[PDB]
Amino acid sequence: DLNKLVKELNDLGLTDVKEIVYNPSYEQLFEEETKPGLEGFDKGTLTTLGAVAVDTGIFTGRSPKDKYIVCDETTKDTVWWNSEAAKNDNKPMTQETWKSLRELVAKQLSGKRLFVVEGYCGASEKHRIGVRMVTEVAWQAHFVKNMFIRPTDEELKNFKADFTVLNGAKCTNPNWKEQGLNSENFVAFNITEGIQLIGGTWYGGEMKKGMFSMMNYFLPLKGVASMHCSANVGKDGDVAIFFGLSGTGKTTLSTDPKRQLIGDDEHGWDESGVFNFEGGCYAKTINLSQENEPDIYGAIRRDALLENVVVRADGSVDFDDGSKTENTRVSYPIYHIDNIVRPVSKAGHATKVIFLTADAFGVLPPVSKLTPEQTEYYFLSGFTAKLEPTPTFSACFGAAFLSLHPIQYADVLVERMKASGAEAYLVNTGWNGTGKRISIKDTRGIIDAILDGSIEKAEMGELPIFNLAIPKALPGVDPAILDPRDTYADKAQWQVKAEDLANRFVKNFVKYTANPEAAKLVGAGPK
């Protein structure tokens, strides 16, 4: 009912609403994106791959410094607010400033032709958020049609919008200084009202990650895990989830011809199992090649939406050109990948949990079986490194999207694992004592041993300092690399580097000891 929709938009403050393009088909979106007369960043270009490409302007990535959550009676004592104790992007916003911003955005979307897309964040009927996004730019509607679950005709008849995203990319906030904000741009959330406002930035990710942040607020409070991970399922129905920061092999190791993909980035884990929050994938395309990333490359066709890629004069795409940004992307509905779970992106309870890390310090074992306490410790640590070794720590493998304290995500994850008897493993896909990277042959052998349970049959030893349980041998894996000390000429070399890494983990974790519940976890961390 377009009549009902317009009244609800008026309620939000949008006036003089002209034509509304509600839930357009992919064909309509293509026509809208290539419409004669589009100017600026609204303009789409049909590439030779058949996919339309658009540019996002000055913002080619998220703007965490411009992210705010309204502080009110609902959020004062529930949100994990940025503090001296532990810095994060959850910056409070007054109700007065929120109102001003809402009016600003409402004004920007008034007296115009609008696109409205309604979809779901969450494949679980019990724990999903119906999202309604309003925009004046067709490709932004396309991004949402790709990234959220597309409702059935039946669902669209009784669709309830639990959260509304008002995309006012074209407007900027003139009173930001007076208001004490970061800039004239803004990505603000009002949890009580159920609204996300976007201003100044055109980057599509703000819509995807904004809703992920909201799921990260509502779900854990209901005992449901909300995770930044990929997930897949074996032919027999066995489910595994993978965590890992960029460069840890997450995408490659969770891509297996024999296991259908549930999702590649955001999942929930409730009483029924693991479910994707998304209806598509938002992949990085820099240096993309058909040879290396056949699944992703193959997905770039009509209905995919390329972002910030360089298009040559003949319409072809130079995927190696990062002139606009190194963060070139492409979004596409999930069925552009063949090896996926259908008809709905969800499966049973996970029984294997894998934490990947590229340990540039060459200290961690290629694989360790974690205790429940260590599972929480390494989940809060969210560690990886790159080469002198430089570490990166990101709580729960996605600190930027945590609306609650890290411990709250760890608690629900381990609760779900305990019920299904799931085992967690820390897997180092990085380097060892040779100074070289662990072979992918061994890493693939390790992932196989984890999934087929052979690691559970192995004789176990224990690595000192970290007190990690490690297998002495595994089918298809070089037993000479299982203990990280064996790849060094002298174990004393490992010992020195281990004390160093242990120190970095401990120093990183100190901020969590300011949280009462998490404080005791230092006992499960190194030394």
Ligand code: NA
């Ligand atoms: Na399309």
